[PDB]
Design an enzyme around this catalytic site. Structure first.
Site, PDB file in Angstrom:
ATOM      1  N   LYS A 154      20.865 -34.238  33.948  1.00  0.00           N
ATOM      2  CA  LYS A 154      21.114 -34.154  35.390  1.00  0.00           C
ATOM      3  C   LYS A 154      21.183 -35.539  35.959  1.00  0.00           C
ATOM      4  O   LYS A 154      22.121 -35.908  36.669  1.00  0.00           O
ATOM      5  CB  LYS A 154      20.006 -33.375  36.100  1.00  0.00           C
ATOM      6  CG  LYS A 154      20.501 -32.405  37.158  1.00  0.00           C
ATOM      7  CD  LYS A 154      19.342 -31.718  37.868  1.00  0.00           C
ATOM      8  CE  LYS A 154      18.520 -30.847  36.914  1.00  0.00           C
ATOM      9  NZ  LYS A 154      17.336 -30.247  37.581  1.00  0.00           N
ATOM     10  N   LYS A 205      14.755 -34.447  44.618  1.00  0.00           N
ATOM     11  CA  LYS A 205      15.126 -33.112  44.172  1.00  0.00           C
ATOM     12  C   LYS A 205      14.575 -32.100  45.163  1.00  0.00           C
ATOM     13  O   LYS A 205      13.372 -32.089  45.447  1.00  0.00           O
ATOM     14  CB  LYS A 205      14.599 -32.837  42.765  1.00  0.00           C
ATOM     15  CG  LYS A 205      14.918 -31.453  42.243  1.00  0.00           C
ATOM     16  CD  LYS A 205      14.466 -31.308  40.809  1.00  0.00           C
ATOM     17  CE  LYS A 205      14.564 -29.880  40.316  1.00  0.00           C
ATOM     18  NZ  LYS A 205      13.641 -28.970  41.049  1.00  0.00           N
ATOM     19  N   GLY A 231      10.273 -37.372  31.369  1.00  0.00           N
ATOM     20  CA  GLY A 231      11.622 -37.034  30.934  1.00  0.00           C
ATOM     21  C   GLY A 231      12.695 -37.899  31.565  1.00  0.00           C
ATOM     22  O   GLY A 231      13.455 -38.581  30.868  1.00  0.00           O
ATOM     23  N   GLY A 283       6.950 -37.767  39.487  1.00  0.00           N
ATOM     24  CA  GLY A 283       6.968 -36.326  39.331  1.00  0.00           C
ATOM     25  C   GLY A 283       7.521 -35.886  37.988  1.00  0.00           C
ATOM     26  O   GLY A 283       7.824 -34.711  37.792  1.00  0.00           O
ATOM     27  N   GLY A 287       7.169 -34.823  34.194  1.00  0.00           N
ATOM     28  CA  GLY A 287       6.077 -34.230  33.463  1.00  0.00           C
ATOM     29  C   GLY A 287       5.645 -35.107  32.304  1.00  0.00           C
ATOM     30  O   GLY A 287       4.617 -35.767  32.390  1.00  0.00           O
ATOM     31  N   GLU A 292      19.983 -31.952  44.302  1.00  0.00           N
ATOM     32  CA  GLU A 292      19.455 -33.303  44.390  1.00  0.00           C
ATOM     33  C   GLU A 292      19.915 -33.982  45.685  1.00  0.00           C
ATOM     34  O   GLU A 292      21.090 -34.325  45.829  1.00  0.00           O
ATOM     35  CB  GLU A 292      19.915 -34.116  43.170  1.00  0.00           C
ATOM     36  CG  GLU A 292      19.574 -33.497  41.811  1.00  0.00           C
ATOM     37  CD  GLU A 292      18.129 -33.736  41.410  1.00  0.00           C
ATOM     38  OE1 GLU A 292      17.327 -34.182  42.260  1.00  0.00           O
ATOM     39  OE2 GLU A 292      17.790 -33.484  40.239  1.00  0.00           O
ATOM     40  N   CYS A 324     -10.886 -54.928  39.978  1.00  0.00           N
ATOM     41  CA  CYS A 324     -11.461 -54.819  38.635  1.00  0.00           C
ATOM     42  C   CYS A 324     -10.907 -55.910  37.688  1.00  0.00           C
ATOM     43  O   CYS A 324     -11.355 -56.056  36.545  1.00  0.00           O
ATOM     44  CB  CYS A 324     -11.185 -53.417  38.077  1.00  0.00           C
ATOM     45  SG  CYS A 324     -12.251 -52.840  36.740  1.00  0.00           S
ATOM     46  N   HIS A 345     -14.479 -47.451  35.943  1.00  0.00           N
ATOM     47  CA  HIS A 345     -14.660 -48.301  34.780  1.00  0.00           C
ATOM     48  C   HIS A 345     -16.120 -48.677  34.553  1.00  0.00           C
ATOM     49  O   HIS A 345     -16.867 -48.978  35.501  1.00  0.00           O
ATOM     50  CB  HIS A 345     -13.871 -49.595  34.943  1.00  0.00           C
ATOM     51  CG  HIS A 345     -12.412 -49.463  34.672  1.00  0.00           C
ATOM     52  ND1 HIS A 345     -11.616 -50.553  34.399  1.00  0.00           N
ATOM     53  CD2 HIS A 345     -11.597 -48.383  34.652  1.00  0.00           C
ATOM     54  CE1 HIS A 345     -10.375 -50.149  34.203  1.00  0.00           C
ATOM     55  NE2 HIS A 345     -10.336 -48.837  34.355  1.00  0.00           N
ATOM     56  N   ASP A 395      11.441 -35.761  41.160  1.00  0.00           N
ATOM     57  CA  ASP A 395      11.459 -34.343  40.880  1.00  0.00           C
ATOM     58  C   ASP A 395      10.060 -33.897  41.218  1.00  0.00           C
ATOM     59  O   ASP A 395       9.107 -34.162  40.489  1.00  0.00           O
ATOM     60  CB  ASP A 395      11.798 -34.045  39.413  1.00  0.00           C
ATOM     61  CG  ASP A 395      13.250 -33.645  39.204  1.00  0.00           C
ATOM     62  OD1 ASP A 395      14.139 -34.177  39.907  1.00  0.00           O
ATOM     63  OD2 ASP A 395      13.500 -32.780  38.335  1.00  0.00           O
ATOM     64  N   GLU A 429     -28.951 -51.224  32.020  1.00  0.00           N
ATOM     65  CA  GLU A 429     -28.846 -52.693  32.001  1.00  0.00           C
ATOM     66  C   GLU A 429     -27.578 -53.179  31.308  1.00  0.00           C
ATOM     67  O   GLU A 429     -27.021 -54.201  31.709  1.00  0.00           O
ATOM     68  CB  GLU A 429     -30.068 -53.353  31.330  1.00  0.00           C
ATOM     69  CG  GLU A 429     -30.253 -53.079  29.839  1.00  0.00           C
ATOM     70  CD  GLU A 429     -30.997 -54.205  29.136  1.00  0.00           C
ATOM     71  OE1 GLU A 429     -30.428 -55.314  29.019  1.00  0.00           O
ATOM     72  OE2 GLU A 429     -32.147 -53.987  28.699  1.00  0.00           O
ATOM     73  N   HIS A 465     -30.762 -44.170  15.671  1.00  0.00           N
ATOM     74  CA  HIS A 465     -30.668 -42.837  16.239  1.00  0.00           C
ATOM     75  C   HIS A 465     -30.706 -41.775  15.152  1.00  0.00           C
ATOM     76  O   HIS A 465     -31.349 -40.740  15.314  1.00  0.00           O
ATOM     77  CB  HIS A 465     -29.385 -42.701  17.062  1.00  0.00           C
ATOM     78  CG  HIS A 465     -28.151 -42.487  16.242  1.00  0.00           C
ATOM     79  ND1 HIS A 465     -27.606 -41.236  16.025  1.00  0.00           N
ATOM     80  CD2 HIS A 465     -27.347 -43.362  15.591  1.00  0.00           C
ATOM     81  CE1 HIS A 465     -26.526 -41.353  15.275  1.00  0.00           C
ATOM     82  NE2 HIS A 465     -26.345 -42.632  14.997  1.00  0.00           N
TER      83      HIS A 465
END
Ligand code: ZN
Ligand code: ZN
Length: 2002
Positions: free
Chosen positions: A1554, A1698, A1578, A1573, A1575, A1736, A1086, A1260, A1665, A1074, A1193
């Site tokens: 680069k 790349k 970067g 892409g 990580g 590239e 949302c 959510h 990348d 509920e 609890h």
């Protein structure tokens, strides 16, 4: 009422047979002419027919199943009815599911598959009329007989002796005749009794319910063809048991392992390349050959089974096996086999066993001494070895040296008490209703006296009452010293019923002293020793077990062979037989030494060897002489003497012996051995893991090496176990990384699966003697359904089946209910209207807690436990109403959730104090509580009968002072039922409670014969039932009551208020349904769902829940709450085993201040006084204990305080991620709702409502109900009636026992974790998340500095113990060392690690310069890094100077109970001031000794700038119409860590530079970008900092599986720390993960374009990348951009892609795919790694092929080492670091120190090195070579002397020394300029860095040697994944070089460094003896790939709680 429906006790056809005897001509029975059979004889003569007898019975049985020539009708009609009812009830579930999971359902009938329905109609016909025959032949009352006679069309026939023969016509078999317990005859001419008939009912109803269960599901896992196939299996099984009688069950006993073998074969088909183990299949084949030598078609069976093509159908068959089952037992052959298996004489190695015993002693000595740090041995010993020094010091506790020295004599010592015998008060801890034999004189006299009659079993409770109680102390003491008397050594046998073995294998029952003996010793075992052993799952509840089931890391076809857990499972012969004294003796001798009484627990096999054995089923055949039973008639029906055995005795003990054998023989190979031991049957998970296979034949060989290693283990185990006289079989099995079987529960791949066939094949079965009632059958369908739900995936099949099997049952009881003794169609006049929507729904749906009958709410399939039945169901009902699309559902919601409350009485409060949470109702008189009332009553009304003083005094206490406690408890105005109940139990009345409750329903009505109570209990049952049904008929008031609540939690409160007089403490919890409501899908807007704020749970499913059970799944888990519960997996006694009385009183005194305070003093003086009555007054009071915790609890007595468990398969919970840390904003008052339950609910609901989705997803949950979100308070009750605990129990106590600023948070949790981490138990959440119920605000460097403090102290204490006192040299080094160990241990330890991921503590760790992570979510690896780094920083500051603790006010906290902290903390401040202070020695030794003895007796925007900008090697390209295709050189591939290293100042990666080089040369002006892409982000960071006014769209594949997020969200991209914490300019920051972060598919692009039109970004720039691993994925994303590009990218816009050289020359040019206005590709060095094809591609958007070819020759992969190397020199010349702020760079030493410390050297050395690097920048080369040296000597020891140094290459050390040599020699080669180093380097990194191993004997043991140019043993190391740390090396040393110059390698200095830091070893020992000088120019050609010969460790598989 009298006897049993379904099956209790075995078959034993002898009864039938001898009745055939007495009947036929008088061939004579034996002794059973005594029986009243003449009734059946009158049936036999009055209706003359003739039986068949046994083997033939099983024949016609087989025939008669699955028959067509038959009738049908009632089958059709019945099932159609069921169908209809179920449609209605499915109206209810319809609205539920459909409102719950958004997916709608239609009611699929069961008529749909036709033939199935026909089959099922025949089975139903048969079952239903068998249900009739069941009903008739089991009824006592002539009334039941007449009512059944009228109902079932039959008639009564009275027989001359006054015996009623019913005659019945049933559509299966036609006519039948039925009399006392006996049945049938004519048509098929057969006699049957209740036992045989009922087992047939079990069969047919099995087939019934299984076909039913599967035939139509929501998931189609089946088709009528599959069902046709299973039906065929039944046909075959029949044909077996058809062709012959009982003998078939040999071949069935074959069926279930054949099933096992098909399973194995599939789960093997999983990851195909593994060798099969010919053993098991071969054995099976043989058993089919022999089986088919007797009777074939088992052949066809086996064949068709293994012809089954599915997991499910197989699992079903294995789920049955018992169908068409249960043959007659021959107890004769059984006993022969048994006695022989006992008598068997065993070879035993003694000193072997003694060595085991020693190993054990070692174990618990270690444990205890790691607990209380008090050696538990006597100081009475020989002044030698370790012991003297040890116990005197209080630690010599030795090292490997002194352990090797010390023989395994650990079993020879003077061992003391240790574990104290827990107080057993009340029977709960001891007694169940299992029976046991009468004593020797009596059994013997019941053989001498009436012989023909089997001797009864005396019920444990009846004897517990009638015999004087046990003095546990004197009992154990006298048993210890003089053993038991002859008259108590007797063991009765009963054939257990279900076995399917024609053998029968009899279960045992003892004599009263033996009973008690085995129980109390079993309980000492399980309480003390069981936990000292991993594996051995006994005490485990469920969740724990399932965790132990995820101690199999199986599955993973995904990662394939990169990790594997082989799984052995062993069965023995009779484990519980071949147990022996001469083996078991030493170990149990040890156990004896330990629990107070030596030579106690060893007396097992002695009590067997002395005792009598007999089978109480046939006493006639035994003869009496010399207090001995002899067999006479020579059947071996009883005997004297035994070498041991018989099942459930010392289950745990013998299991600990075996499990010890294993842990001893585990050492042989260091192989990873995980174990699960259930009594007899055991499984061994054997873990290995691989390093990146290459040539695929490696997999063959290596995996075959895993097999070899496995088989070695098993052989060692076979022989070892064999030495003890246990026969292990080569036909007992094992499987690959897949499958496993534990106690008949299958795990398949990486996942648990239940047998829905089995649970549903139970259903209508009622437990022993209970009989079916409105409550009971519903209870059965219920429990079994919730079980199914619990084990399966999304709990739905359980719901719809629930609805079905429920209404099936309901129609059965409507047909007839044995409780009301007549039909419920016939009863309408009596009781109100039974036939209504009202009644149906009620019977199957409302809960008992809302006050109606039974049958769940459909809200319980959600949270497995949860503590609020009322709120749960009331919430459910409100919810079904609000989502009801009909009317009468609303009507039913009001109707139901307005329960009519009865007017309060102190009676009712006694009931609902005895259990809390419930409500006073106009019904609720249960057979349960009514029988409790009756047994209370009877037990009380005879308090003068009882011969037991424990019980006598308890009953007296009850009868007298129960009122006093009643009223006193009831007067507490803030009504706290939990406290009233815990106190109520914790009072001496806990005895009364234990016993009154102890009686189980049927056993009670059996045990209620103790007195005049016979009829009362029966008519009481009738009372309860009429009242129940009356309540439902009453509940047809429809709509008469009130309305739809508002948020039923507040109304459950008000209803509890109205129920009682007053308001209640607020122990009611709004449950997730509920409050959280349906899920908001974030894939949709949302946006209105946004409250802003955090009132928001979420869950992620990357990859989605789509197809589960088909793989383990990536993400870790979430199991549930922490604290355990009652174990529902088995049925021994165990429910109330937990928490005896003294411990209860102690704990509610451990409450006190929390919700009361001593100021109150009334309830308190009372509490302490309870503790004073139980004990004496030991009260010192308590003060300053203030507790802010939540009262709903949490408050309990050591029992379950929990919030719930997941009711779900691990499956979906492995595909999901629940996230909590999003909710920090409900911190508020720290109020009601259970985070446990909430999280669990999100999980289930997500799985259910996704149900399959392959596009991944995010979900959510935002609180819908802010009103009943309910903020708490803290009320502290007192009141009083002025009560005192009366009736001093010290008499009982005699007879019972045997004498049983945040810096503060930092110091607290940090010391607590130090000490606890040294004890080695619970890491769980004591490192919690952010401000707690202990409050706080600032958590900074305050928290961390404090952490270091408390922790350092903890190591102080563990280091006074850890070390020999008389060796004091540099205590600094001792304590420092210990803390170092702790810190490392903490950086690995995860919960703290997520704690530091999230929050403001990250900052205090981001202040110190480290390095950026790389992993997007930042794995435990990078976290461990940062944590260590910061700590080595601060701890460095410690190793130099003095450590001040600042502060020094020790704020102890409410979350620390007792002295586990206090004493050592005080002692630790003093001990820091004593130990870290001196750096020296003094009188301190005295003080240490003293205080350690006291302890062991105490437990009695950032600045920035420019950056590197490189050169662009350009490739302009065009595409004009026609192709000139494909002609191109495809590049080579070198991995060249070189330039990847030369990039110096790298943030998470130099792709950074680069992109700078692109946007430098290629001339981009981008106002805004999309970077996909990245990580850690970067290139995002790069772009964003470079062009400061730019906004950007960040996207990262979310790499999850490698990290455990413990209640936390994956956090931002780490790289965006770069911007100084202000990420605002990156719009997608902090929310990144909750969108379609997948670039492989669309919808992500719809989301970007959303973000474009959303923030008006315009996205001038695209950058990707990819790091593309798939041509598929590549072409996919190419198409994606192809679609979305020029509707996203701007009008001058830019796209950088790349690309890989090989991949672009490969096949399908993405260059071709995407051609916009201005198209090119580039290579950019002064960034990019060397010899790299990677380039590239580029598009400015809004012959040629030969020029392409030319450029490809101008590309880098093609070009050679001179280009490579010279270019890297150019980069060396560049300043690669420059504008980087210091926060980002490492400390250009601390990285060295930590790296050498990553490579295995001591930190001291690391630091001396790092200093020498600081001091000698000039001569670097020398120091580098010195690193080579130092790492070499500390890893591989080119010098030292030792006794047998075996193979210390051993993978890893060799690995890191190899890679070290590589990185070093790389940047060295680059400095010293030598090419062939570089060439070598390349060829090496490619393949096989040589390590050639030798051990040379100069004596002193022998020295060791490693090389290259020679050939020893080649442990030669591969490096593939190893460019990263090589990179670290080059980077570090480039980083310490600081652009500074270099000077010649100075050999003198090298020598200085070397002999300085190491022994005296020199350039010489390095030169020749053994070493790396080869790395002058010398080497050898490749030899070994054999690091791809892998290794073994253990596997990390994470779930949370237990
Ligand atoms: Zn609510
Ligand atoms: Zn939302």
């Amino acid at each position: 009422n009298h006897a049993d429906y379904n099956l209790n006790s075995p078959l034993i056809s002898d009864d039938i047979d001898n009745l055939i005897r007495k009947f036929n001509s008088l061939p004579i029975p034996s002794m059973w002419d005594s029986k009243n059979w003449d009734g059946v004889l009158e049936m036999l003569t009055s209706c003359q027919a003739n039986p068949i007898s046994t083997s033939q019975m099983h024949k016609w049985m087989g025939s008669w199943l699955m028959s067509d020539n038959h009738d049908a009708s009632q089958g059709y009609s019945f099932l159609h009815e069921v169908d209809k009812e179920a449609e209605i009830t499915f109206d209810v579930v319809e609205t539920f599911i459909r409102g719950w999971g958004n997916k709608p359902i239609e009611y699929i009938k069961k008529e749909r598959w036709t033939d199935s329905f026909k089959i099922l109609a025949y089975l139903c016909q048969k079952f239903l009329d068998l249900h009739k025959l069941t009903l008739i032949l089991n009824a006592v009352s002539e009334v039941e007989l007449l009512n059944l006679a009228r109902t079932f069309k039959g008639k009564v026939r009275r027989s001359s002796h006054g015996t009623n023969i019913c005659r019945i016509r049933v559509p299966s078999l036609g006519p039948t005749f039925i009399s006392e317990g006996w049945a049938y005859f004519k048509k098929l001419d057969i006699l049957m009794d209740r036992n045989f008939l009922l087992m047939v009912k079990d069969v047919i109803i099995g087939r019934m319910q299984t076909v039913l269960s599967m035939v139509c599901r929501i998931d189609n896992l089946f088709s009528e063809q599959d069902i046709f196939s299973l039906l065929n299996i039944y046909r075959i099984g029949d044909k077996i048991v058809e062709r012959q009688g009982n003998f078939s069950y040999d071949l069935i006993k074959m069926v279930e392992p054949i099933c096992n073998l098909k399973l194995m074969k599939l789960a093997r088909e999983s990851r195909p390349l593994v060798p099969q183990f010919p053993h098991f299949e071969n054995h099976i084949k043989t058993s089919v050959d022999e089986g088919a030598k007797i009777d074939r078609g088992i052949r066809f069976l086996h064949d068709q089974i293994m012809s089954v093509k599915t997991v499910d159908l197989t699992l079903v068959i294995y789920g049955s096996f018992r169908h068409w089952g249960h043959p007659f037992i021959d107890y004769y052959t059984g006993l022969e086999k048994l006695h022989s298996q006992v008598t068997m004489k065993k070879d035993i190695d003694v000193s072997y066993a003694k060595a085991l015993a020693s190993d054990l002693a070692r174990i618990v000595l270690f444990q205890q001494f790691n607990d209380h740090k008090k050696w538990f041995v006597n100081g009475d010993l020989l002044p030698h070895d370790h012991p003297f020094k040890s116990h005197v010091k209080e630690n010599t506790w030795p090292t490997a040296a002194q352990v090797q020295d010390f023989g395994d004599k650990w079993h020879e010592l003077p061992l003391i008490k240790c574990f104290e015998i827990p107080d057993l008060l009340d029977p709960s801890i001891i007694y169940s209703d299992k029976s046991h034999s009468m004593n020797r004189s009596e059994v013997l006299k019941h053989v001498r006296m009436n012989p023909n009659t089997p001797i009864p079993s005396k019920k444990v409770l009846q004897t517990m009452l009638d015999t004087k109680a046990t003095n546990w102390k004197e009992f154990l003491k006298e048993i210890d010293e003089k053993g038991l008397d002859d008259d108590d050594l007797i063991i009765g046998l009963k054939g257990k019923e279900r076995e399917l073995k024609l053998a029968g294998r009899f279960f045992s029952l003892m004599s009263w002293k033996l009973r008690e003996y085995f129980v109390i010793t079993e309980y000492l075992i399980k309480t003390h020793f069981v936990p000292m052993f991993k594996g051995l799952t006994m005490a485990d509840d469920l969740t724990a077990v399932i965790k132990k089931m995820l101690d199999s890391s199986s599955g993973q076809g995904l990662k394939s062979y990169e990790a594997i857990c082989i799984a052995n499972h062993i069965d023995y012969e009779k484990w519980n037989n071949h147990q022996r004294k001469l083996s078991n003796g030493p170990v149990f001798r040890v156990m004896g030494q330990f629990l107070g009484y030596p030579s106690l627990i060893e007396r097992t096999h002695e009590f067997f060897e002395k005792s009598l054995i007999y089978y109480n089923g046939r006493p006639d055949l035994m003869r009496v002489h010399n207090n001995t039973l002899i067999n006479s008639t020579s059947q071996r029906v009883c005997w004297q003497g035994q070498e041991g055995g018989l099942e459930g005795l010392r289950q745990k003990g013998w299991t600990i012996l075996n499990l010890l054998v294993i842990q001893r023989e585990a050492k042989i190979r260091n192989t990873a051995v995980k174990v699960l031991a259930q009594g007899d049957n055991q499984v061994i998970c054997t873990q290995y893991k691989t390093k990146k296979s290459r040539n695929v034949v490696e997999l063959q060989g290596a995996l075959n090496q895993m097999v070899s290693n496995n088989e070695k283990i098993m052989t060692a185990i076979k022989i070892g176990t064999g030495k003890l006289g246990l026969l292990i079989n080569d036909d007992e099995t094992m499987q690959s990384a897949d499958y496993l079987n534990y106690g008949k529960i299958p795990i398949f791949r990486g996942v648990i699966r239940g047998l829905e066939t089995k649970r549903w094949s139970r259903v209508t079965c009622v437990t022993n003697d209970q009989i079916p009632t409105c409550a009971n059958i519903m209870s059965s369908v219920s429990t079994n359904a919730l079980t199914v739900a619990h084990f399966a995936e999304n709990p739905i099949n359980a719901m719809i089946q629930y609805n079905y099997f429920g209404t099936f049952a309901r129609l059965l009881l409507m047909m007839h209910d044995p409780a009301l003794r007549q039909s419920l169609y016939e009863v309408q006049d009596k009781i109100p209207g039974l036939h209504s929507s009202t009644f149906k729904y009620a019977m199957l749906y409302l809960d008992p807690s809302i006050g109606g009958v039974s049958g769940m709410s459909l809200s319980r399939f959600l949270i497995r436990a949860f503590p609020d039945p009322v709120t749960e169901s009331l919430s459910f009902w409100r919810f079904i109403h609000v989502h009801a699309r009909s009317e009468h559902l609303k009507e039913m919601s009001a109707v139901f959730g307005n329960p009519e409350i009865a007017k309060f009485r102190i009676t009712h409060i006694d009931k609902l104090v005895e259990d809390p949470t419930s409500l006073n109702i106009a019904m609720g008189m249960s057979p349960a509580n009514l029988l409790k009332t009756e047994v209370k009553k009877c037990l009380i009304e005879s308090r003068q009968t009882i011969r037991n003083q424990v019980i006598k005094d308890a009953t007296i206490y009850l009868y007298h002072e129960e009122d006093r406690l009643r009223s006193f408890l009831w007067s507490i105005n803030p009504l706290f039922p939990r406290f009233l109940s815990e106190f109520k139990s914790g009072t001496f009345l806990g005895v009364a409670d234990g016993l009154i409750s102890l009686f189980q329903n049927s056993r009670t009505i059996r045990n209620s014969f103790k007195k005049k109570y016979h009829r009362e209990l029966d008519d009481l049952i009738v009372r309860s039932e009429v009242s129940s049904l009356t309540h439902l008929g009453k509940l047809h008031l429809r709509r008469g009551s009130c309305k739809m609540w508002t948020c039923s939690a507040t109304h459950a409160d008000t209803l509890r208020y109205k129920s009682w007089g007053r308001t209640v403490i607020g122990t009611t919890v709004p449950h997730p349904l509920e409050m959280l409501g349906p899920q908001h899908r974030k894939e949709t807007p949302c946006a209105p769902c946004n409250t802003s704020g955090f009132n928001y749970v979420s869950v992620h499913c990357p990859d989605g829940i789509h197809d589960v059970f088909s793989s383990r799944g990536p993400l870790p888990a979430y199991l549930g709450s922490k604290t355990s519960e009652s174990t529902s997996i088995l049925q021994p006694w165990e429910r109330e085993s937990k928490v005896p009385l003294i411990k209860r009183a102690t704990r509610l005194r451990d409450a006190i201040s929390w919700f009361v305070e001593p100021d109150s003093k009334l309830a308190m003086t009372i509490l302490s006084n309870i503790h004073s009555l139980t004990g004496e007054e030991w009260t010192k009071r308590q003060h300053g204990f203030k507790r802010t915790g939540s009262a709903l609890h949490r408050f309990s007595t050591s029992r379950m305080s929990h919030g719930g468990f997941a009711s779900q398969s691990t499956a979906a919970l492995t595909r999901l991620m629940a996230t909590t840390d999003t909710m920090r904003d409900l911190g508020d008052q720290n109020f009601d709702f259970l985070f446990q339950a909430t999280l669990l609910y999100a999980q289930i609901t997500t799985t259910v409502a996704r149900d399959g989705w392959i596009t991944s997803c995010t979900d959510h949950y935002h609180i819908a109900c802010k009103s009943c979100l309910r903020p708490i308070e803290e009320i502290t009750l007192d009141s009083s009636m002025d009560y005192t605990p009366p009736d001093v129990s010290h008499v009982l106590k005699t007879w019972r026992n045997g004498e049983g600023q945040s810096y503060q948070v930092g110091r607290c949790i940090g010391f607590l974790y130090g000490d606890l981490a040294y004890r080695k138990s619970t890491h769980a959440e004591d490192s919690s998340l952010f401000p707690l119920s202990i409050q706080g605000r600032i958590r900074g460097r305050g928290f961390l500095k404090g952490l270091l403090d408390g922790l350092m102290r903890a190591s102080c204490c563990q280091v006074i113990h850890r070390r020999s006192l008389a060796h004091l040299k540099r205590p600094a080094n001792a304590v420092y060392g210990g803390l170092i160990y702790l810190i490392d241990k903490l950086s690995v330890s995860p919960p703290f690690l997520s704690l530091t991921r999230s929050g403001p503590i990250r900052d205090e760790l981001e202040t110190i310069p480290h390095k950026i992570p790389t992993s997007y979510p930042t794995s435990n690896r990078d976290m461990g890094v940062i944590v260590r780094n910061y700590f080595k920083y601060q701890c460095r500051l410690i190793e130099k100077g003095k450590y001040r603790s600042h502060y020094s006010q020790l704020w102890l906290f409410s979350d620390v109970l007792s002295i586990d902290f206090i004493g050592p903390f005080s002692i630790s401040t003093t001990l820091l001031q004593i130990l870290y202070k001196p750096f020296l020695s003094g009188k301190d030794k005295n003080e240490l000794r003293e205080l350690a003895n006291l302890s062991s007796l105490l437990r009695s925007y950032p600045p920035w700038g420019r950056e590197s900008r490189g050169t662009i090697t350009t490739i302009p390209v065009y595409y004009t119409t026609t192709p000139y295709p494909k002609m191109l050189e495809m590049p080579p591939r070198i991995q060249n860590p070189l330039l990847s290293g030369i990039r110096l100042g790298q943030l998470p990666t130099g792709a950074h530079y680069k992109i700078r080089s692109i946007l430098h040369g290629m001339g981009i002006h981008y106002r805004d970008f999309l970077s996909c892409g990245d990580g850690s982000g970067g290139m995002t960071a790069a772009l964003l900092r470079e062009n400061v006014h730019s906004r950007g769209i960040f996207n990262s594949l979310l790499e999850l599986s490698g990290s455990v997020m413990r209640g936390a969200s994956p956090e931002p991209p780490s790289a965006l720390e770069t911007l100084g914490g202000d990420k605002s300019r990156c719009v997608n920051g902090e929310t990144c993960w909750e969108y379609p972060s997948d670039l492989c598919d669309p919808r992500t692009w719809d989301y970007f374009l959303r973000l474009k039109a959303g923030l008006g970004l315009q996205i001038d720039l695209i950058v990707m990348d990819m790091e593309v691993r798939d041509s598929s994925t590549s072409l996919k994303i190419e198409t994606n951009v192809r679609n979305y590009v020029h509707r996203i990218l701007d009008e001058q816009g830019v796209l950088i892609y790349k690309t890989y050289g090989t991949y672009i020359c490969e096949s399908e040019k993405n260059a071709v795919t995407i051609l916009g206005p201005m198209f090119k590709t580039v290579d950019l060095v002064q960034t990019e790694f060397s010899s790299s094809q990677t380039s590239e591609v580029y598009m400015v958007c809004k012959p040629d092929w030969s020029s392409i070819n030319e450029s490809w020759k101008n590309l880098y992969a093609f070009q050679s080492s001179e280009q490579e190397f010279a270019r890297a020199k150019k980069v060396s010349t560049y300043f690669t670091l420059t504008g980087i702020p210091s926060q980002f760079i490492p400390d250009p030493f601390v990285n060295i120190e930590t790296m050498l410390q990553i490579f295995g050297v001591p930190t001291g050395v690391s630091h001396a090195a790092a200093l020498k690097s600081s001091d000698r920048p000039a001569d670097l080369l020398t120091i580098s070579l010195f690193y080579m040296a130092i790492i070499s000597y500390y890893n591989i020891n080119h010098i030292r002397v030792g006794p047998i140094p075996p193979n210390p290459p051993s993978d890893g050390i060799a690995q890191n020394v190899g890679i070290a040599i590589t990185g070093i020699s790389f940047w060295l080669s680059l400095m010293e300029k030598d090419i062939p180093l570089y060439q070598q380097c390349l060829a090496v990194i490619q393949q096989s860095f040589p390590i050639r191993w030798e051990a040379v004997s100069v004596k002193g043991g022998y020295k060791q040697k490693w090389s290259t140019r020679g050939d020893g043993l080649p442990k030669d190391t591969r490096i593939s994944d190893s460019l990263a740390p090589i990179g670290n090396w080059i980077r570090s040393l480039e980083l310490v070089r600081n652009q500074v110059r270099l000077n010649p390698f100075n050999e003198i200095l090298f020598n200085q460094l070397c002999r300085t830091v190491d022994n005296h070893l020199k350039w010489s020992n390095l030169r020749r003896n053994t070493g790396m000088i080869e790395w002058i120019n010398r080497r050898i050609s490749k030899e070994d790939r054999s690091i791809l010969m892998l290794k073994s460790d253990l596997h990390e598989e994470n779930s949370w709680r237990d």
